[PDB]
Design an enzyme around this catalytic site. Structure first.
Site, short mmCIF file in Angstrom:
data_model
loop_
_atom_site.label_atom_id
_atom_site.label_comp_id
_atom_site.label_asym_id
_atom_site.label_seq_id
_atom_site.Cartn_x
_atom_site.Cartn_y
_atom_site.Cartn_z
N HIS A 120 0.82 -1.21 0.00
CA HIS A 120 0.00 0.00 0.00
C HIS A 120 0.86 1.27 0.00
O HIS A 120 1.94 1.30 0.58
CB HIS A 120 -0.97 0.00 1.20
CG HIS A 120 -0.33 -0.24 2.53
ND1 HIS A 120 -1.06 -0.34 3.70
CD2 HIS A 120 0.97 -0.39 2.89
CE1 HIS A 120 -0.25 -0.55 4.71
NE2 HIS A 120 0.99 -0.59 4.26
C1 LIG Z 1 15.58 -5.06 3.92
C2 LIG Z 1 14.51 -5.19 5.00
C3 LIG Z 1 13.17 -4.73 4.45
C4 LIG Z 1 12.14 -5.85 4.58
C5 LIG Z 1 10.86 -5.46 3.85
C6 LIG Z 1 10.19 -6.72 3.32
C7 LIG Z 1 8.96 -6.34 2.50
C8 LIG Z 1 7.74 -6.27 3.43
C9 LIG Z 1 6.50 -6.80 2.71
C10 LIG Z 1 5.50 -5.67 2.50
C11 LIG Z 1 4.44 -5.73 3.58
C12 LIG Z 1 3.65 -4.42 3.59
O1 LIG Z 1 2.37 -4.66 3.03
C13 LIG Z 1 3.50 -3.91 5.02
C14 LIG Z 1 4.37 -2.68 5.23
O2 LIG Z 1 5.60 -2.85 5.27
O3 LIG Z 1 3.78 -1.59 5.38
#
Ligand SMILES: CCCCCCCCCCC[C@@H](O)CC(=O)O
Ligand SMILES: CCCCCCCCCCC[C@@H](O)CC(=O)O
Ligand SMILES: CCCCCCCCCCC[C@@H](O)CC(=O)O
Ligand SMILES: CCCCCCCCCCC[C@@H](O)CC(=O)O
Lengths: 333, 49, 332, 334, 63, 72
Positions: free
Chosen positions: A238
């Protein structure tokens, strides 16, 4: 389908060298092309291979022409010329042809001229399909969603409510656009849902792959710039914003509230942290662990590549204990 | 003495459940405890002694 | 329902107990009971077998001593488990008969005992072989050919000009033959490369759910015979997978990749394009396959978890491993 | 459209109202984009000085925020939570469906509860049980003998296999698959012999699942999703995975078979977790986690070396490969 | 030459309350401590590193 | 020395000696990837016991460029 080489050369703004009455039946690779087939060549190394290619015509550069062993269309960018000529001889069918009776269209849906809807596709109320729009079979377009002119959905695509898709966009099957973002507040261990009332705005000439998920925003919108291309299996959370003409390869996971700039190229299976920004003209190589913001353009990379197992086992243990060795090195100094 | 260390870290693989990282790490831990620079308990005990 | 003796022979197993016992289904040791048959594979589980209330237990000739009920002696309990689970399979079919709700083009040719589920869609020119089952809400594109005994669960997408062999199984949400990621860069702008190639899937191929296998640009993407692919996989255009190779969940493959046969790709592995992986290769989970693999064996990568505060130190020292290398040499 | 007096809302949220209680609120918005008639919220004290730029009729904040307020204020102790609450009261999100669609295909053996709605071209198999107030999105498929508890909702094009059991007040986004064959195959001299998966997926209460996520059925025993669990998009839950109550799984996580996750855990997105092991309670795994081994103590755990400029990484990478070489030189330097 | 204060401030500016006012990462505060250890040829126990959360605290440790 | 440097390139880059000509580019003619040119420098540093500054390592993109550095 079948076309004349000389006419084809005109439409590609190419330099016809050889019989123009050659009839081209389609496109093919050097390895595989036979008669009626036009192919191309981007690497200079495959200059010798022109003498093993049974193709009628080969798209090359002016500096390759001495190596030509058949008719030749000369250009500045054989790869782009391949893209164009492939479109002319594209054998690809449409997701559907006009409105299938099997479909379920709400009375309030506003159709443009020459709109096609696949079989058993479902259109909710308030939906506006533009001119020359094609909805593949089994698709679902949510309430009040707008799909721009000339845009097309393959079979089994899901568009939620209040989604805005621009002109001449393409979406492969399995893809879901506008589902609830991962928005939850925590109350003493329990999760309280945060209704996602934002949307997804998609620009013009945007192509999305298969089984990709672009979530609607919590409050404001999730935005895909124009001329952007996204591959399969991508997660776009989002309130992410992507700049015009940016490219995203397969398996990319984007965290929420991420801003990606223009003409960026995001390598496959890369993982991008949220609530930060990436500047224009950035290239993340595959499996990129994008933990921090990127302020200056260029290429960025991460990850130790493969090693034999026994070698890795020892590589891994030393890194995990790298602090201990950093210390017993500092002491030795 | 050696055996207590093995238990702390965790045939190592077939009876005691080791993963691929542990047998390497186990050798490393013995190097530190015994300050000196093997797939079973018995093999470790006899050599080290 | 089957007699243990009639079961023991279909599995080519040495029966060691009452052969007139009635078997009703399969279950795990920890939860199996009377009427049920199970198996064990790990030698450690011998001294706990008596606690298993199973009617019968598949094991080896070496496990036979510790037997605490009717035994089925074989060489490969896990294999025997697989077959005896197939005999006693409780899984239904994606469809039976042909649904009135299903939309089938006139030019589509069907074999015998073909089933097509509710609201499924079949395009023009499609050939479905004998005993082929198409789950509900599925889509089969133009001129695609699905071989005999092949089954699609609910909501599968087959594009145009796709070839599926015999006895294949594709789970739900899976997409086969979508445009490969082909684009030419016209001065910053992306021009589409139409993908006119195909996907050729061989015999006895099983594919998991929400997996994407793209059609080739000009030439074809190939899934060899006996290949198994898990969920959430991405197999790009012009990838070629050898026979009996296995691809676990969440694997991301780049285009024009050639994988030999009898390979095992650990899940979440990421494989670069335009290179070869030879026969008989195992890549472990989260593998970073950047280069070709020329000789067989196991290849791995990745630095595992540490407590957060420790990771921070680990990370920062590695990002400055160069300086640390300079320091090391300057002390020599 | 909704409409409500700021006072009523403050009362429904248990908030200290600083301002005109007769203000009518029509919805909820961000500070940047808020209009007259909208309420917003503030969690980060950096946005304090900016509060004057906002066009919102009301701002949800804290006591220490009140001095910087330049609007009507709803003072509470946890704004992000009351934001979540008032976002629900002013929710605009439509329903996956209303009433029974004609185009839908419902087997006569199907047991339908009260006030149940099924969208267009959805497909309900035999022996199915749908509790009261359940909404099945258009184009869905629900396999044989599966039960979905009351209040639970499926968006369009969701796939539920056979013998799957979902609790009540659950929510599943489109593209998601529940109850497909786990990756179970026996090897016979090179060839793969299938292992039929006769187990199930048991999903608890108040469970929310994202889009294009796959939760496989167990081989023999069951794949179990605890209550209050939230799972994001593009996730893979293997067969025989057990996830404890109130645990969160962010997008793109790859779970192996027979993995047990305790209660109140947070698995960061793109994390990759090995199988046949256990994660204890109150564990947080940061993004891109490489969970190779069990976790026995609560806390935060991390892995991964982040980005560097390419030329720098080439040298960083090459060096880490040759790390056994380093430790041999260093040791010889002793 | 250079004062302690100036040297601490120079290191901080190059690397980037660290987290709140400036915008620290989970690595930057660690990398900052390491850089401070190097500049001043000193070992900072993590109990103390843990107490370095402001510009002043860094100045104070060396002092 | 010329021959020895060239032998290393063939081993590191995996090419027969006849292909490793003086005017050949590591990347453009010899197929080398994102990490080989670095690994090659490392192999030269070890073999000839010398430290190569990165401003110069970056300019060594051909064999001949490599020969010249090493001789010096
Ligand atoms: C390098 C470390 C970064 C890790 C991020 C991994 C990706 C997260 C998945 C997206 C989930 C989103 O819908 C929720 C948010 O985050 O708002
Ligand atoms: C040093 C170059 C590394 C490239 C980083 C990954 C590029 C981002 C992928 C964009 C996909 C387009 O390129 C389309 C294509 O290529 O089919
Ligand atoms: C870790 C090494 C880098 C691995 C890169 C994997 C990227 C996967 C891209 C899949 C999308 C393909 O459709 C693009 C292509 O045609 O290649
Ligand atoms: C540290 C990385 C550990 C490797 C994780 C591999 C995850 C592969 C997904 C498994 C999918 C299951 O359906 C099969 C199984 O697991 O039996």
């Amino acid at each position: 389908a079948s076309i004349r080489l000389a006419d084809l050369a005109q439409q590609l703004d190419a330099e016809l060298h050889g019989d123009g009455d050659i009839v081209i039946t389609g496109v093919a690779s050097m390895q595989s092309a036979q008669t009626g087939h036009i192919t191309f060549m981007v690497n200079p190394k495959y200059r010798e291979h022109l003498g093993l290619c049974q193709a009628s015509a080969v798209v090359m550069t002016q500096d390759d022409l001495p190596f030509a062993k058949s008719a030749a269309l000369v250009v500045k960018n054989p790869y782009l010329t391949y893209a164009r000529m492939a479109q002319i001889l594209d054998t690809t069918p449409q997701p559907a042809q006009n409105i299938a009776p099997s479909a379920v269209i709400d009375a309030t849906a506003k159709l443009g001229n020459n709109v096609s809807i696949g079989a058993n596709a479902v259109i909710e109320s308030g939906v506006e399909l533009g001119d020359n729009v094609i909805i593949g079979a089994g698709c679902f377009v949510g309430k009040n969603s707008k799909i721009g002119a000339g845009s097309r959905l393959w079979a089994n695509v899901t568009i939620y409510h209040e989604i805005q898709i621009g002109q001449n966009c393409l979406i492969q099957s399995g893809t879901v656009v506008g589902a609830d973002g991962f928005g939850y507040a925590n109350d003493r261990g329990n999760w309280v849902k945060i209704p996602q009332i934002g949307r997804v705005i998609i620009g013009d000439r945007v192509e999305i792959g298969a089984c990709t998920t672009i979530d609607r925003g919590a409050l404001d919108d999730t935005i895909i710039g124009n001329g952007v291309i996204i591959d399969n299996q991508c997660q776009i959370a989002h309130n992410v914003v992507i700049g015009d003409n940016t490219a995203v390869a397969g398996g990319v996971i984007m965290a929420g509230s991420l801003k990606i700039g223009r003409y960026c190229m995001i390598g496959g299976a890369s993982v991008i942290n949220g609530h930060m920004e990436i500047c224009d003209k950035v290239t993340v190589t595959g499996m990129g662990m994008v933990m921090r913001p990127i302020t200056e353009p260029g290429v960025y990379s991460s990850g130790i590549p493969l090693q034999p197992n026994k070698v890795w086992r020892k590589t891994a243990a030393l890194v995990m204990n790298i602090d201990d060795m950093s210390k017993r090195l500092k002491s030795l100094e | 003495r050696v055996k207590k260390i093995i238990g702390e870290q965790l045939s190592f693989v077939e009876d005691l459940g080791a993963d691929s990282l542990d047998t390497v790490e186990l050798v490393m831990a013995l190097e530190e405890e015994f300050d000196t620079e093997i797939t079973t308990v018995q093999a470790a005990i006899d050599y080290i002694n």
